[PDB]
Design a protein around this ligand. Structure first.
Ligand SMILES: CSc1ccccc1Nc1nc(N2CCNCC2)nc2c(NCC3CC3)ncnc12
Ligand SMILES: CSc1ccccc1Nc1nc(N2CCNCC2)nc2c(NCC3CC3)ncnc12
Lengths: 301, 296
């Protein structure tokens, strides 16, 4: 259906079906056991952020690869259950829609993960060419297939050239896997999220070290953003002033899975509403902190 | 009386193909993934169908998109699903199946979902005429024993040349099920069961457990790569070597395949030696393939 010009926030990245089984002890190879409970959840960074953005009350759309099938079906249903617009999906002829198996050992809370396979093509720069962008006021890109996504980022730059400052599509990027490839993305977007895990691999030991040490890699004018779990989150702009917000511990911690996806979407959301980096950064921490005391996303409102 | 009927579970098998089994805490990416209509009695129907034997599945199913997939599968295969006992309470079971591509080991985490078992009542209303053979997967023992007695009774009304042959699997090591030995013309006891009860080989098992079977019954017990053995009224232990493929790559449903093929062979007149032998033959072939397609 009809979508008003410049109203949606689009996230581009992975969606995946996580099957999650809770067990007494970890199963010895070649045995048949029962779990205590089993959940089917929709996963993925770009995917979760959409779930959150919807709850926060923004129109939003997901772009990611799916292949027709029963996994795609459950995945699409959940998306829609969360108010997420699914019309930009790049359906594939080749490969499996991603699906991971996770086994949580109940007595010691360990997680053993069999990761979705690699068969499905990522969204391509030509997949992306075909998208009428007028729809969006903000595009956010989970870093995955970098050479391609660079072309999409350049495409968005083009578009903006011609639009007055109030009809420009804001852009953000997330680099959350320690993979040399992705590091180029640092040079794109108005907002750049770098993850504690990436920063530790590059050798930094605190969000301030990360921001101060990586700011040079970002494009001029850009805000670089780093969250450190319970240590809060920082951010650094062109003004060179290091911004910070402490965490907001919940009553008790229950589910931190997807917390960073929540921090991301919330920061994005707050900025798109015209708030300040300092304000977006705080909000980001508040929503993500609430999430951690909750199971899933339902509570977070 | 032309169909064969299997009575047990149907289950979504959510399969991950892994090149080695992961350890606790580890995070290893899988090679491929597929969805697959599982459940012991469900698998046997698949296997029977492929062998060209008209057959029927009977079990519980909760309506939903899961069931919608399981069903299309049965049909693409010619499995009479009309005896199915639909629920409206609980959801379709499903399990995670890690199949290790370097030894065909299959590790299963099953999500059992309450979903009522098919009951002697559900069974009380089945037209026993259309079935030459009935196979029951050990599950709800007490409720099934009624189902079993229903057949015997029906047998004692028909000519020896019109009876319904009955087979019975006892796969999981649960006390409730050991009463199921006393029924059926053929009884399958798994290696897993055999060990748990103190036995080191299938030959030993067969000797130990023959006490517990009906008079005139054949006790069957496979032992993986070791082959499979049988035991009849005659007192003579029968054996058959395995037919290992050169690359064992997926054993999920091997045993369900062994049982189907043994039943099939027996229902076609062939001897126990011959059906035992055929059972290993087809199961072995299966372990060389992903899934079931192409075991013929
Ligand atoms: C700064 S918000 C954020 C951003 C990205 C990921 C996670 C978070 N938030 C939090 N993560 C964790 N993490 C906990 C451990 N693993 C990483 C995340 N703990 C807390 C917390 N209390 C923490 C107590 C120790 C558990 N209070 C508020 N926010 C977060
Ligand atoms: C007697 S056939 C049979 C009946 C019921 C279950 C399984 C089977 N057959 C086989 N099962 C297993 N397994 C089932 C139990 N878990 C381990 C493997 N491995 C093999 C195998 N393995 C490779 C050869 C020795 C080197 N070769 C032939 N048949 C079977």
């Amino acid at each position: 259906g009809l979508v008003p010009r410049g109203s949606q926030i689009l996230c581009v990245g992975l969606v995946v079906l996580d099957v999650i089984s809770l067990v007494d002890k970890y199963p010895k190879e070649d045995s048949e056991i029962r779990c205590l409970s089993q959940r089917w959840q929709r996963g993925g960074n770009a995917s979760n952020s959409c779930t959150v953005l919807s709850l926060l009350g923004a129109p939003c759309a997901f772009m990611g690869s799916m292949a027709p099938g029963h996994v795609a079906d459950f995945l699409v249903a959940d998306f829609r259950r969360r108010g997420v617009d699914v019309s930009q999906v790049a359906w594939q002829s080749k490969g499996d829609t991603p699906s991971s198996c996770c086994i949580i050992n109940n007595s010691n809370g360990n997680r053993t993960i069999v990761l979705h396979d690699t068969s499905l093509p990522d969204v391509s720069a030509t997949d992306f060419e075909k998208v009428d962008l007028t729809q969006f006021k903000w595009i956010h890109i989970e870093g995955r297939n970098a050479s391609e996504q660079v072309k999409m980022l350049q495409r968005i730059d083009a578009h903006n050239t011609r639009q007055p400052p109030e009809q420009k599509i804001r852009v953000s990027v997330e680099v959350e896997k320690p993979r040399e490839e992705l590091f180029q993305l640092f040079g794109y977007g108005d907002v750049v999220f770098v993850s504690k895990d990436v920063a530790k691999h590059l050798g930094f030991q605190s969000a301030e070290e990360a921001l101060r040490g990586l700011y040079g890699r970002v494009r001029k004018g850009a805000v670089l953003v780093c969250a450190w779990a319970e240590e809060g989150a920082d951010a650094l702009g062109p003004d060179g002033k290091l911004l910070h917000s402490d965490a907001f511990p919940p009553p008790r911690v229950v589910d931190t899975l997807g917390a960073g996806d929540t921090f991301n979407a919330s920061v994005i959301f707050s900025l798109s509403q015209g708030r300040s980096v300092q304000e977006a950064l705080r909000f980001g921490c508040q929503v993500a902190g609430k999430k951690c005391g909750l199971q899933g996303f339902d509570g977070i409102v």
